[PDB]
Write a protein that binds this ligand. Sequence first.
Ligand code: HEM
Ligand SMILES: c1ccc2[nH]cnc2c1
Length: 289
Amino acid sequence: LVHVASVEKGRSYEDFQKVYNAIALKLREDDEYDNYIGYGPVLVRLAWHISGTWDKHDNTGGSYGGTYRFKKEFNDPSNAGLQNGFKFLEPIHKEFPWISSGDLFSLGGVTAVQEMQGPKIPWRCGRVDTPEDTTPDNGRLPDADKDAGYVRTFFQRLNMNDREVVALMGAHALGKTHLKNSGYEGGGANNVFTNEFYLNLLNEDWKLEKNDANNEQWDSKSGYMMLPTDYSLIQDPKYLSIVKEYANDQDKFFKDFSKAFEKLLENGITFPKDAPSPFIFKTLEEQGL
Ligand code: HEM
Ligand SMILES: c1ccc2[nH]cnc2c1
């Protein structure tokens, strides 16, 4: 199963920068969403969920085919809430209908990370929409009520190692859980890309509690929460070392996240030898927009 990147006909860096800018401007405009968090976090989660269906063993799933647009994937219980991200991206797609669905979903995550003052995430175009029967079945995204061993094994399927896993989980500094979506009770939330997930894990006074959906979660006196899979990163000695590293080195975290997140978004894609180099988009701020 080979998915070869194919650049949208006639498109170059400037075309994609325009798409980035449209997403970025809408992010700024639609600021009231989810109690003033805005759509950044849900767009990062969307980019991850469209990518996290990948299976290294047979190259099924992954971002390439844009298959989240189809009902089977769109209605995955693991994707509850992501319809908000899809609806946010709808007018962007209508404006720039030349871009593939995989490219738009993945670019949405990149743009969200950067606009939320995260690292630059190099991004490559050329994902090609594939037909409805290429949609992966539900059940490939991870459970949150599990331990470090489950997290480690799960991420092997996505060819991610311990450092990559701990780095990617740092995205949980963004946004919040919603009881109605996932059965987890939201805590204190923000919409700035930082290493604060790791600081919270290490510095907070955590207590294990059972929420109103009957799921266990870790809650702090300060009003923050962690999923059991989040908290596993301080229960496992290997994960713990890396949590400490990122809590104490913002730059290292930024750089490692950027690599891991680009890799997540590119898993399953074969880039031809003469494909364009990855693009690094300018933020609205860098452009004076
Ligand atoms: C073991 C791995 C993971 C599990 C079990 C997990 C689970 C969850 C759950 C249950 C939520 C709450 C959904 C809701 O109620 O709306 C959530 C939110 C989120 N997740 Fe993860 N996640 C994992 C890995 C990741 C990774 C790798 C990324 C990105 C790199 C990510 C980004 C997010 C973001 C940005 C949100 C907030 C969405 C919002 O505010 O609407 N997650 N995740
Ligand atoms: C999802 C969203 C926000 C979070 N904060 C801590 N764990 C999280 C999971």
